Every structure is written in structure tokens, then in C-alpha cells.
Amino acid sequence: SVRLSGYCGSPWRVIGYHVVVWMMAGIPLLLFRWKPLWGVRLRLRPCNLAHAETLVIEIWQLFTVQVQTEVLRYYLFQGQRYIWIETQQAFYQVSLLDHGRSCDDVHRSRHGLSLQDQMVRKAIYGPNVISIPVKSYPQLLVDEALNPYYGFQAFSIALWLADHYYWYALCIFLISSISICLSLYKTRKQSQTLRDMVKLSMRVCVCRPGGEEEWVDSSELVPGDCLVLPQEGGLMPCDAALVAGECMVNESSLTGESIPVLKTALPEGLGPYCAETHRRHTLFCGTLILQARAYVGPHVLAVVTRTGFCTAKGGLVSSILHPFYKHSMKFVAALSVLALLGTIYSIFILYRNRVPLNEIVIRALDLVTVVVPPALPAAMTVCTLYAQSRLRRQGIFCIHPLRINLGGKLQLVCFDKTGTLTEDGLDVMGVVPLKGQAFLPLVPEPRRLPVGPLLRALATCHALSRLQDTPVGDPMDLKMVESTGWVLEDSAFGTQVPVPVSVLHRFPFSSALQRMSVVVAWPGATQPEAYVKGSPELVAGLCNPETVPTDFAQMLQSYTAAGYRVVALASKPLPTVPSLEAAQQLTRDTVEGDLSLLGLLVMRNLLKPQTTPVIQALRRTRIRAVMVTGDNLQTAVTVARGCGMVAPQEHLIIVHATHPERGQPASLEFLPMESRSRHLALSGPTFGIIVKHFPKLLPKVLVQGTVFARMAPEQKTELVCELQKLQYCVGMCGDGANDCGALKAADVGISLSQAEASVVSPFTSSMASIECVPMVIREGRCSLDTSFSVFKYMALYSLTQFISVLILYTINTNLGDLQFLAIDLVITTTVAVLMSRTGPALVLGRVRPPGALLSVPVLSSLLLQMVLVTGVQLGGYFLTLAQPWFVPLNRTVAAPDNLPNYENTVVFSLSSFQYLILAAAVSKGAPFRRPLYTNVPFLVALALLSSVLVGLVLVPGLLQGPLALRNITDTGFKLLLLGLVTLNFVGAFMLESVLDQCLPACLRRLRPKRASKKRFKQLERELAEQPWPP
């Protein structure tokens, strides 16, 4: 449901709004960016819908869209136009103007469109372009840079500049600025590549009333224009409905299948024209017309029906354009409320110490930047940068590195078929010759077969020309002659190495009679021989019955039910003398008469060699593999059973749904197929009917379904979204233009193609196999584990520095500029860059990393680590007090004036080691990363930083001038501090190990989580309790 709000404008109100939002402060514009309803309520007054210059579109969800006039008032909401009909006073989508008109209307539209009516319809429907708006750099900056965390980083930088902390301020500013500029460049480049992708400019021929034909640009098309399709064929600019002639279309855009499709003229009648009902008379936008024949009339005619975003390609692009981290933000919000508490406490104690109010507020605001680290997102992006580099080395190109963390949460991967799991093109399984009238065993490689009539039939009965020093034409005959091993020289042929034979005459292949025939002769022969190739079934009806076996039909169905593409061949001895002086005057009706079936050649879409190992690895690690294809259900089911998606022992149950006509409801029919546990194999129409009429039974279909065939691109997108609504993390591997909406909607969409799909997909694989799915899943599990470790380290670092600065505020001192800089830059940047370094484990496991940063393991680790940290720091500070040589810190003046002092020296000496200890403690190895001892840069960095800090503590006068450290002469106390921090080094590792090993078992033993909150897990449980299809 949609609600519209009519808001006209008032100039005095406009200037008032501008001044009150600009001169007062920048906060109002920001909060209105958060909620535009208040902004549009204050800025513009409510008016009637007949005078509105602004709309508030609610879906609630707030969008605002300005009503534009050309008169005809319209607005564009998510690409789809809505015009203003003055008569009935409403905004009607343009798709619904001519919706529901009869086939006789489309046929009447065959004469053309008057140029004035073309102007009216170009005003209404707009130009026939799929326009992507490429925003300018300020337009992207106001969208991105105003991120709440970039605002917090700007506040932190301003405060640090106000606090003489210029160096870390500069580092954070440079990091955030370069990250922002890189993201703006990436976003603009993606928008530009998409706009270059969907762009289609070409000259088309349109009929005009009175018999005139004019060539207009493809953008000047409007629903009603009568396209005149070229005979040689070309790309399709707009959804048209054939009103004359026939076409052969390459619909690999819609179906992902390069197989030619026959489109016939729309049948005249008084029935509503429908893209779904009349799909065989509709030419879709983006699909390539191979050839168009005009039997009656001078040229083939098509009547435009949808243009722009109304087309199928337009709908897919509109879906593309207009579709842990949450726990991370929740934890930084908890850190923020802890910041508020610590800040009010700091105000209290700093006022107790007679600190001036300016420095009081400076310190109290600086504690906020202390405990809420402004360098957390960069620290957590370093690991994804490492993973992106490793993927680029392996051939997989990720455009947004933070999308790699989603590869580690995957519970389900949806797979294309043609081009992703199976080879792009057909390959010949073999040929089955005939000896008399009984079939012979399948000959897998036709070349070994002796030199007889059927072999020359395979090698010569085809229409392909020699150009670019390569045979070119229809792929099936190409691959068949490639298998026979013969090299071609009407036209002459040479054997592999067995006499050269030349074809004398050839007849064209027409899809009406659905076969082609040639006549051939060679020297030393008796008389010219004819060859016939085409459909398997009908040519058997042409040959004599005593030549075709009686078991022809059942064998043909056994081949076809497996997804094969069978073609039959026959020959003829011609009593005419061997010379083309009489051979090319022959009528082919004589050829297809009295035929004798030689044999059937079978071609099947081979599976890639790298498909079955990857599918069995995914199914071994408890990752669901789904096949969402655009091919028929028989081929999809055969490939699924053959690529390991359906193991030989598992049950496949076809789901069939009949759309309810008048007088009956909708039905589901389950028929099993003989050779989790049950897989459901349902078509595209069945999926649509289950979505619409059976929304109760859709979750069980999505949980059990494995094979989704005949799926339209919008249906693949809908399936990915419906699976994600079951709280799946859906990955999608495809290589076609039909896979684009799914690769965009999927959590991890991987594209094997370099055209039309690398744009929308986050990942693009340079290889053609699905070997890139386990690679991305391993890198994603590694990046997720590493981002967990880096977040735990940054949390423990911020909390340790919070405690160290509270202990020093309480006694009227502080860490100081250079100790702060050491801790913030030298230790923390080194640690957070070299933690994120170690790569993924070499093998996939059945258990995936946790996806919640608020887990009881994570929070328990942070709590106990910080208890140990504050214990060690307070122990060191209080043993400092019990010493005889200890003297107070001259509280009358505040830091950095009273530095150096023993309190600061001891707190810094302990805290500096604690940062390295926590760094090493939170880092993990198996099962998702390589063991930590392989991270030799990290271990060497920890050793070197620990050596520097031990030199600070022990070696006198070493870096105690710059860092402002008091020199402790008592060697016993220095050794006691070192023993205390070694106690901490042992305790941190023992705590981490004990937690990781015991807390899962203890949590299982104390509070058994008998119910999973994931929706698909509840569905799986209730299905195991009671199977849905009996």
C-alpha cells in the first residue's frame, strides 16, 4: 500500500526554513536527513494532490519525489513513471495505461503511429532508455561522509586539535579522507559502468501511418510504434509483440540458454495480451534476434508494448538499482554510554582537583575519544584488504572488501547451470547408427566408426562457411564435425587422413519442416548420395517403417528425459547420374521421400570437471547447494543428480502447481523420481504459484527445494530474497544477464562472466568453474575470524586506555602526549595491521565462525580480560604506593606539568605491555586461519615491541626524556613490575584458552538451547518431526 502527501510551496516559508536550518545550526538538516517527514512538513505546506509540487511516497518507508510537469504532471518513483490523469484525479503508473488491451488492438497497431501521437506517447511513457543517474562527487559525499561514525571521527579530530594532539589527529584524518575518496571513486565508477552496460543506442525502422517508413533512434520508441525488424536480425530495443512474420531469437538474456527460440505472429482475437500467456509471440528487450522471416508482407512487423523501465530488462535493472555489523554498532553504543558515565565521573574528580573548567571539559570530552576508538572501522577493514589481495591473486576480484566477511556466514549457495555448473555449449555424447532396422550401442567418439554413409552424413550434412580460417555457423553442427575429425575444404570436404568428398547441392534449414537436407557425391561412387538431418521424431515419420525401429519412441524419450538434444539423420541413393547439371534442379520433396534412417546423434550439455568436487565439498561442510536455472526441469534434475546436489540415495520429489482457472482452486501435485534427505524439484511457474496461492507452504519448499528450473531473472531474485527471509546467508554463482538481479540480491554473489554480470556482483571470477565458491568461503571465514579478533583487540585496547586514564585522572595526572602517541600509533597500528595478516586455513570445515559480536563468549572474554587488566594495573599502582622511595606527584598542578611521576611511569609501563599481551591473546589460528606461529611478522613485532618496552623499564634514561618517564632506581621494583606483567601475559592466554575450550561445553550443559532462532532451522526441525510431502 502507498500513501501520497501533497505539499506545495510558500516562498516566505521557503526562506524561513532556509534561514532557520542554516543560521541556527547544522543539526536540523542532519536530523531531517534522518527523518525527512519533519523537514518536508516545515519546509512545504500541505496542499491538495492536484497542485502538489512535492510528494511523500510511503510504502512505513518515507521517500520524497518532486512532481514534474511537461501539460502532464508526472513523477518517477524508483524508475517507474506515474502520470496525472486530470479526469479521475489520481497518479496512475504508466505500465497500467494500455494494460489489458486485446490482441486485436496490437494487430490494429500494425499500421504505425502518427507522429503527433508519438509525441503524446513520448511525453507519457518517456524516452525508451533505461537511465541510471550517475551522482556527482558532492552528491555522493553528502550521502556517505555524513555517516554518524565519520561525524564522530570529525569531532574527535577537532577535539584532538584543540588538545595539542596533532599527530594522531592527522593520521586519523588522512585515513578517513583517503577511505572516503576511494569509496566515492568506486561508487561513481560502478554507476558509470552500469550506465554504460544498460545503454542501448541503435537505429530502428518504425512504420508510420500512410505507408511511410522512417529510421528513428531506439530511444524514440513508444508503446504503439510498429517496429520493422531487419531480416539479418539484431538486438531488441523494446518489448514488442510480433504482428507479422516469424523470428528466431537468442533469449540467453532471459533464459541463459543460447538455443534459438521460434516466435510467431500474435494470433488475432479478443483476448488480453499478456507477456506470460503470449510469451511465444513477444520479443523481449535485450534478446538478440538471430533471423526474421516475413512469409506474407514485405517485411516482418512488431508492435512495441513496453519501453524503458517497463520492459523485462527494465524491471531487472530497476531491481538492481532499488533493492555482526549491527552487533558492532550496538557494542560501540554500549561503549558510548560507558563513555558518558566515565565522562561525568571525570568531571567530578577533575573538579575535585581544582582543574580549570576549560581543561575540565577538554579532558572529559577526550575520555570519550579514548574509550570509543575513532580508528575501529579502519582496523577492521585491514583484514578485508588482506583477503581482497589474496582473492585477487587467486583470480577472484572483489570490488567492496567488506563484502568478504559475508562469505564466512554462508549457509546456502544458489547455482546457475548453463555456464556455471555445466559447459556453455553442447558437446556430442555420440551417435547411434542403424544396422538394418535395430538400434546399435552408443558410439561415444564417432571418429573410430568405419568410413560409411553415416560418417559422411555427420561430416558434411551442414550449412557452415569458412571465414577467419575457422568454421562458423550453428554450434551443434560445428561441434559434430569437430568430433568427426574431418576438416572441410557446393563445397568440398577432406577426411581426417578416406577420400575427399564434395557436396553438390544444399537446401536451407527452415523451422517449419524442422529439418535440412543435402546431396553429395564423390569420385568412384555409384551415384550421388543425399543426407537428411533434423528433428528426431518427424524424420522417422518420413523414412520407411522397415528402416526405423519400433523402439524408436521409447529410446528417444529416454534420451530426451535426461536433457539430451537428439538429432536424427537419414540418407538416399539417387538414381540420377552423378553430375550437378541435374542435381541442383531437384525438388527436396523427392529427398525427404522414401528415407532410410541412418542413426541418431545425441548431444548433451557436459558438466564441468570442477563442478562435482566443489558441490561435494560444499555438501560435506553442511552448506546447502541449490540449482536455480532457466533450463527445463528434466535437464536441471539430471544435472543435479549428476553433479552431486542430489546424492544417489536421496529422494527427489517434483512439485507441480496448476494455476486455478474459474471454478477450481490451485493445486500442488508431488510425483517422486526413482534413482538433507528429501529434495524438491519445482519449476518457475510452480514457484510463482506457490508464492502467490500457497504462501503457507512456501517456507517448506524453500527449505527442501534443491532444483529450481525455468526460473525467470525476476524469479531468481525473488527466490534469493525469499531464502534470505528464512534467515539464510545466500550466495549465488552465475554467469549470465539473467543472474544479475540474483547476484545483486545475494549476500555473496559471484560472477564467472566478464560481461553484464561483473557489474552487479560483488565478486568476479577470472576462471569459469565454481572453484571460486570454496575460495571465497574460506577467505570469508578467515576475514570474519580476523575481524572478531581485531574488534576484541580494539575493545580491550580502548578499555585498557580508559582504565589507565581514569587511574591517572583520579590522582590529577595523565599519560601525556607522547605516551598517548606511542600507545595509539606505534603499538596499536602495528598490532592491528599485523594481526589481520595471517591467511585462511587450507581446508573448509563444517563449523562456521560466530556471526554475533555480542556473543556470551565474546563478552565473557572482554569482561574477564578487562578484569585481569584492571587488576594488574591497580596492583602495580598500589604496590608503587607501598614503596619507601615513592613520592607523590605534586597534585597542585595538572598534567603535563607534573610529569614525570612514579604513578604515570608505572601505569604506562604496565599498560604498554598489556596492549601487546591482549593483541597476542585475542588472535587465533585454527579452524579458520593458519596457526598463529606462522604469522612471523606478528611474532617478530610483538618481540621487538616487548623488547623496546623492557628497555624502557630496565635500561635507565632510555626514551625517558621524550616519553616523560620517571627513572626508578630500585631494580627490585622493576623486576616486580616485570613479574606482574608476566603474570598478566600468562593469565590472558590461560583465560582465552580456558574460555574457548570450556565455555561452549558449559553453555551446552547449563542452558540447553533446544530451539534455534533461525527460521530455516525451525523449519528443518519441524520437517524432521513431520515431513511435508507424504
Ligand SMILES: CC(C)CCC[C@@H](C)[C@H]1CC[C@H]2[C@@H]3CC=C4C[C@@H](OC(=O)CCC(=O)O)CC[C@]4(C)[C@H]3CC[C@]12C
Ligand atoms: C596511520 C598510518 C601510519 C597507518 C598505515 C597502515 C598501512 C601501512 C597498512 C594499511 C593497509 C595495509 C595493506 C593492506 C593490504 C595489503 C596486501 C598484502 O598483499 C597480499 O596479501 C598478497 C598475498 C597473496 O596473494 O598470497 C600486502 C600488504 C598490504 C598492501 C598492506 C600494507 C600495509 C597497509 C598499506
Ligand SMILES: CC(C)CCC[C@@H](C)[C@H]1CC[C@H]2[C@@H]3CC=C4C[C@@H](OC(=O)CCC(=O)O)CC[C@]4(C)[C@H]3CC[C@]12C
Ligand atoms: C615517533 C613515533 C611516535 C612514531 C614512529 C613512526 C610510526 C608511524 C611507525 C613506527 C612503527 C611503524 C609500523 C611498523 C609496522 C607496520 C606493519 C606494516 O605492514 C606490513 O608489513 C605488510 C606486509 C604483510 O602484511 O605481509 C605496515 C606499516 C606499519 C603499521 C608501520 C606503520 C608506521 C609505524 C606505526
Ligand SMILES: CC(C)CCC[C@@H](C)[C@H]1CC[C@H]2[C@@H]3CC=C4C[C@@H](OC(=O)CCC(=O)O)CC[C@]4(C)[C@H]3CC[C@]12C
Ligand atoms: C624480552 C622480550 C624479547 C620478550 C619476549 C616475549 C615472548 C616470550 C613472547 C612474545 C609473543 C609470544 C608468542 C605470542 C604467541 C604465540 C603463538 C602460540 O601458538 C599456539 O598456541 C597454537 C595456535 C595456532 O594454531 O595458531 C605459541 C606461542 C607464541 C609464539 C608466543 C611465544 C612467546 C612469545 C614469543
Ligand SMILES: [Mg+2]
Ligand atoms: Mg548461465
